[PDB]
Symmetry: D2
Subunit: 291 residues, 4 copies
């Protein structure tokens, strides 16, 4: 499938031992598609606490998310890992389940050269034969990819695009102009309106789990040139984002989901659960914005 | 006069001894208003090599720029200096000349506290009794102002707004939302279209000396909701910006002005003159975009 | 055992499929102890490519390293992982094998709060009942631990020390005097002499796999006050370190080992093998410094 | 030779940010007579130099030079983003008899290395005095590589560097690569480590109040008396941590005021010493006999 559109970065509920709550995960997946009216799920991304999981758990999440949704839902599998053998194992697994594309975070922690980064992507693709989306998130990885480095990556026909989670709108514009044929999905929910007018083909976000209807309006109105109306909705969305960030984003988003009757569980340690000192403020937010 | 609109950050031509070429400066000021059709000049900003000047040269520039243009032209005088006595002297001088507002870069080099930075502004204002625009440029100063700190500054009735030269659109949006009454002039030329849809009241830029007609169309088109055309013009603008940044922005911009018959002189040492290795590339750029 | 002394951060040889070469690993362990005359091994650290390994491989390295050396050798097991369940599993395994202490890198990638970081350490300790050494490496993790935060960690009787891989000697000195009872092992081989005079109890380093004999002399001479000879040996060591850093440190160190007849294998992808453009220079380094 | 321990000279101001010349002479005399230092580093960061106009910088250079005897080593920091000012100040300080010039790496703008190099070469050409590079990356954001130092140090009048950076790998590389050049360390809190790394001396704001301990650290470390030297570094770093937490330049001047010096005020926009810290400061002064 063509991969344009709006995606929930799927959140994952855990128990107190860091085990996946499969029933809750199914509910979250269904919420994203049926209630928030999104186009797809981006599975085992940062938002899903993926980097805290073991391999079996990642496979479990891929399977449960796939089983939770209908065949018209777009599915992107984030398989990036510092363990290339694991990335390949997961990529093959997701591909076999029928995920529409793979995605992989740029290798982090170690100071890998660009050549080492490039060939990580190329090795995953060679082993899986699926399409690949680069996941660039410099604020967490410390890895910056230049316009010239993107050119080298985008030379590969199976590197179909990028999930761009970075604040630099000059770089985004240069990417958009240089690669009109590639897919660009923005990852900064708080800058969706600016990303939209910068020509992104869609967006992937944790907050779309609770605010996906509003996000769609921002995206659509901005492209229809109802920019003031789009920007007003971005103000509202950014009230939400600022609030959940101040309370701990992944556990807070899952608490908003619990209010909808979802078995939203716990974050995976060492993340701590939502602090009940924030409960009153959260309830006021949910009330104000009908979350 | 409200101070909304589009401003050239006025460039300054020097001779071989780092003295101001007044005739050339008058031509540059006239170019910005008559040829580039801008609303105003921002004088002795970073783009004017201000921080390389002595006090008398700064006064020389204020005087020459004020005399070069008509009374309808908006004029903002950047008087920030690590010497607060100098800032006040320049502030009084520019105010006596009839500059419409003062502006001042956040104190830099030393790690001033926020209270120290706040009272710098308050002291300039007390001594000069003119309106003040905060000049925030964290990529050069390493100073970041929080929303709460902006609140304290904007509590002063004579702090009328901010020249925001930073890449963070979450912060820009929060500022725009929190201070709907204050003036926000964007300073990042390569993100004019995103700043415009984020509700800025105008912009101040070095590249508007050569590309002010496009910049106006971007600003106007984006506010009309014609965001695709606005963004195409941003693409063209960013081809220019990418090119001139690569060559040495201030000297290169002045070489473009020399092409129009302006005596654009030299940069002030230690800035080096335009490298003639870039001449053929610059000529191609000028031809391509009709500069 | 007393945990003072000099440790090799144990390097690991892989095959072309990223599997551990057990023969080579035993030889590397044996080289560190028998040839380089080191006090111990720090196993599954950054230098062992630990963060690229799966859980069964980490167990393999712990087992193989322990089996390879005499019971009078000090053994520290690095078990930090973003997967807390994995860290606990590994800490229990290493403890059962008889490792003298555990160590854990500060959780990275996600912006964990200090409370979250603290409870990661406390959770590992309670599950394993072994002594714990904090592994602080801000240049790779982006995590900075303050003096007050160290104080909160060191309040735990089972947090016995820190592997301090950071360039700041003010902070090191503050730690040293605040916690005179705790173990401080320095992780920056290129500043061994400075760390020694700052009162570290020893050091842990990748370069000690090939230069442990010089390192011991630096440590010993500096503590004896023979500071000029110690610093001269630091100059020689830093010639080696600057060179291997320039060539790609882990593959290069393993190539030096190969010259000793060790089955040094390959790095684990996505690290690339030693680049043979550096071979001529490496062979001359080996000859000059008798490695 | 310019080896030795220097006070980065502090400057007292009045309410209008004019130099208090009487205080300034006392601060200079305190550094040489009471703290027993080898020299003064005048119009550096610690002197609030970048807040001053050109005539104030000359005032400071003159008053400092007149306050001290002819044995006292004097280095003049004349770096300015205005190269014409740097050259002017370079000539004036050189005419006053200052032993060497120094200049901070140009900052604020993203100058290229070539621009920075020729700023140094241009000040030297016009003054013909010796030049000490002032590297302070934590304030300037400018990093000089070993290869870039080699290019600067190929100039025979670039005699050395005031190295105010935390990187001891780079320091050691510099010391090894340039055994003939002067390296003066600027991080007071790492003096013992710098000393054993072979620096030729040091320049610091805290040596205005703690130069006697600093000299013992330097001498003891060079004798191999590492443990005693380090103990004195501990004492020194209690002082440095404390004054840093209170606002370093105003706090050091409040310490000098305790000794009966007319230490004035900082130059705005620096604020004065906050009296909330007065009790803690008094305890510090008692504890370390400052």
């Amino acid at each position: 499938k063509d991969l344009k559109g709006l995606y929930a970065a799927l959140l994952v509920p855990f128990d107190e031992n860091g085990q996946v709550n499969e029933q809750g995960l199914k509910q979250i997946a269904q919420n994203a598609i049926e209630t928030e009216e999104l186009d797809g799920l981006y599975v085992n991304g940062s938002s899903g606490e993926n980097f805290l999981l073991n391999t079996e758990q990642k496979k479990q999440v891929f399977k449960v998310a796939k089983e939770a949704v209908g065949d018209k839902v777009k599915l992107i599998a984030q398989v990036g890992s510092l363990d290339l053998n694991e990335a390949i194992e997961l990529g093959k697994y997701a591909t076999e389940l029928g995920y529409d594309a793979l995605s992989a975070v740029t290798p982090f922690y170690y100071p890998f050269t660009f050549e080492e980064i490039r060939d990580y992507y190329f090795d995953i693709i060679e082993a899986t034969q699926n399409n690949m989306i680069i996941y660039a998130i410099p604020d967490l990885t410390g890895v910056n990819i230049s316009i010239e480095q993107f050119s080298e990556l985008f030379n590969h026909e199976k590197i179909v695009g990028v999930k761009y989670t970075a604040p630099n709108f000059f770089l985004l514009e240069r990417i958009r102009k240089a690669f009109p044929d590639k897919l660009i999905l923005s990852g900064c929910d708080e800058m969706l309106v600016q990303a939209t007018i910068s020509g992104v083909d869609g967006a992937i976000g944790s907050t779309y789990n609770v605010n996906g209807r509003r996000a769609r309006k921002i995206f659509d109105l901005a492209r229809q040139g109802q920019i003031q109306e789009a920007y007003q909705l971005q103000h509202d969305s950014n009230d939400i984002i600022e609030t959940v960030l101040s309370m701990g984003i992944y556990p807070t988003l899952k608490e908003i989901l619990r209010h909808r009757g979802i078995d939203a569980g716990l974050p995976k340690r060492p993340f701590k659960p939502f602090n009940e000192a924030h409960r009153q403020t959260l309830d006021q937010l949910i009330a104000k914005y009908d979350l």
